[PDB]
Amino acid sequence: PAPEYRRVPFVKEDMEKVMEEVPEFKYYYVGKENTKGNVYEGIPLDQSILEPADLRDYVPPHSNIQYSKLDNGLRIASMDRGGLTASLGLFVHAGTRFEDVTNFGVTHMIQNLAFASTAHLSLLRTVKTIEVLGANAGCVVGREHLVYSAECLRSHMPLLVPMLTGNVLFPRFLPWELKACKEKLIMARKRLEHMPDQMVSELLHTTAWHNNTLGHKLHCTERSLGHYNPDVIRHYMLQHFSPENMVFVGVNVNHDELCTWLMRAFVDYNAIPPSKRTVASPVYTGGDVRLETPSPHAHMAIAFETPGGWNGGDLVAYSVLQTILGGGGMYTRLYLNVLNQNEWVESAMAFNTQYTDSGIFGLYMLADPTKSANAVKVMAEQFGKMGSVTKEELQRAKNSLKSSIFMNLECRGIVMEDVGRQLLMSNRVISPQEFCTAIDAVTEADIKRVVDAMYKKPPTVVAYGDVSTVPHYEEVRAALRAAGV
Amino acid sequence: KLHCTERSLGHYNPDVIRHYMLQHFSPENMVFVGVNVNHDELCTWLMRAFVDYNAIPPSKRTVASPVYTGGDVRLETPSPHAHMAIAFETPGGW
Numbered sequence: 001p002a003p004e005y006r007r008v009p010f011v012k013e014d015m016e017k018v019m020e021e022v023p024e025f026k027y028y029y030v031g032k033e034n035t036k037g038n039v040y041e042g043i044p045l046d047q048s049i050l051e052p053a054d055l056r057d058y059v060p061p062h063s064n065i066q067y068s069k070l071d072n073g074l075r076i077a078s079m080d081r082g083g084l085t086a087s088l089g090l091f092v093h094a095g096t097r098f099e100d101v102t103n104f105g106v107t108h109m110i111q112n113l114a115f116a117s118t119a120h121l122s123l124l125r126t127v128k129t130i131e132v133l134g135a136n137a138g139c140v141v142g143r144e145h146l147v148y149s150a151e152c153l154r155s156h157m158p159l160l161v162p163m164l165t166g167n168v169l170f171p172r173f174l175p176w177e178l179k180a181c182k183e184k185l186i187m188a189r190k191r192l193e194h195m196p197d198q199m200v201s202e203l204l205h206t207t208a209w210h211n212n213t214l215g216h217k218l219h220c221t222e223r224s225l226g227h228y229n230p231d232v233i234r235h236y237m238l239q240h241f242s243p244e245n246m247v248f249v250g251v252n253v254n255h256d257e258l259c260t261w262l263m264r265a266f267v268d269y270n271a272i273p274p275s276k277r278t279v280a281s282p283v284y285t286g287g288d289v290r291l292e293t294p295s296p297h298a299h300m301a302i303a304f305e306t307p308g309g310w311n312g313g314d315l316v317a318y319s320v321l322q323t324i325l326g327g328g329g330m331y332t333r334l335y336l337n338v339l340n341q342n343e344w345v346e347s348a349m350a351f352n353t354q355y356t357d358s359g360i361f362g363l364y365m366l367a368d369p370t371k372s373a374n375a376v377k378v379m380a381e382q383f384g385k386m387g388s389v390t391k392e393e394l395q396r397a398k399n400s401l402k403s404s405i406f407m408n409l410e411c412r413g414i415v416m417e418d419v420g421r422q423l424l425m426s427n428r429v430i431s432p433q434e435f436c437t438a439i440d441a442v443t444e445a446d447i448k449r450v451v452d453a454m455y456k457k458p459p460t461v462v463a464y465g466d467v468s469t470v471p472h473y474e475e476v477r478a479a480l481r482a483a484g485v
Numbered sequence: 486k487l488h489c490t491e492r493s494l495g496h497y498n499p500d501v502i503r504h505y506m507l508q509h510f511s512p513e514n515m516v517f518v519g520v521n522v523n524h525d526e527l528c529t530w531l532m533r534a535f536v537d538y539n540a541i542p543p544s545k546r547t548v549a550s551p552v553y554t555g556g557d558v559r560l561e562t563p564s565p566h567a568h569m570a571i572a573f574e575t576p577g578g579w
Contacts, residue, residue: 222563294491466492472554 005069066255073244078255086252089149091420094240097213105224114139119170173230185220210285242272286458295465298369303362303460323397325350344368369466384483511541
């Protein structure tokens, strides 16, 4: 069931009366009107200075999500917890899985151009104002989403909504800004050369879905710097950045003010018109890849596909199984049956990554580079016996996962991005009580029912570092075959 | 590989070089060839080179058969062509 959005109609108003609702803002301080100075000078900090006028009788705010929609299509969601700082975020359904042979790299360019010159503000003025308000702001690319966000005191929200929406309503893309911003496209990967874990992540993705959708790289290659001209950026944006592909989310703001100041942003201008885009299903290839470098471990990872991804019904099964095995505790399956029984492994882990319509699940390990052939055997055994579980471990895992669920959402930024991401993915937010009710229902049998389906396509195999002893492709797949995988 | 990788610059100390040479550079693993020279002078001046000194002593080394794996690999770069190659093994070689 989707939420029942409340309508927000467009209305046109006298600017000289709307200017009485704008927050006060100063950039110069030509003298100062107040001469009284530090009125609490010489008072120790264990001696109060509050007057009885500044006492209150506490009334909580109400913190269930409020859902609204503008007439042009934009969806708005808000919460308040009575904190003093607010979190604001704009979510666009424009990831890299939507590019093609003529587009590769365009999303990175757009992100690298966030908060650049727009119709009514320059780049310098924008960023300097964001600095002087005291805020922190930024933009993030993924494989399915693009996100802009900002954060400071809640009384500054009216000044931040423009600067966030600007980027999607009317950027200019002057050539001399594109040209000056180019080197940041290369540094993004130059830093990955000293982050082995993330590197292995990217290898897994490009090996699992070879040359399509989720397989695409998250960065601009050398071949991607040709089509770095404004027309390609603009033509790409015209296909994705329409309002009905967006969500705006706010935490610690009053919802009617948020609705008002968002409506007042789109009322004068024509937004990008809608488009009935279609999306192709990922094709999972699997395969094998190696990359050698002087690292003192053999880094290895093996993975299998999750059919259906986030829209598959078994989203809870994998997330419980990951905690049976051992996530990124000391009574977990891997900790007991690998790390405490072998001297030459530094770390073993289970990983689980999901997207709207496909995912992957697997194991990751660091080992002594002289014993990679034993590392493969250990991994093959482990995969061998994921099919079967005992109720002690299962209960341990279900309780642990419930605890983690509840305790992870005690933080406003995580909540904001969670709500956004869920609304983009399926137009519904799953409240934690529902997550717990779903976790409680997972059976012992369903684990086997899921794994038997997981092993029906070829594996994805990655090695990194001192790989000098890793068996050959056929040897790895035969080791997995012997262990019944 | 025909080159030194980064991992290959550790063991760049004289003892490893010398110990490797002691296993291969003995005379019975060598040939000396000359074109446009008079053979008796060549023999004479080669004999006069080894007469004073002890050469590296022989070793009965053994060599393992190559194992052919085959497989597949790709490497992207801005070149304006798709370069492709496919190959199969010659059993026994020369």
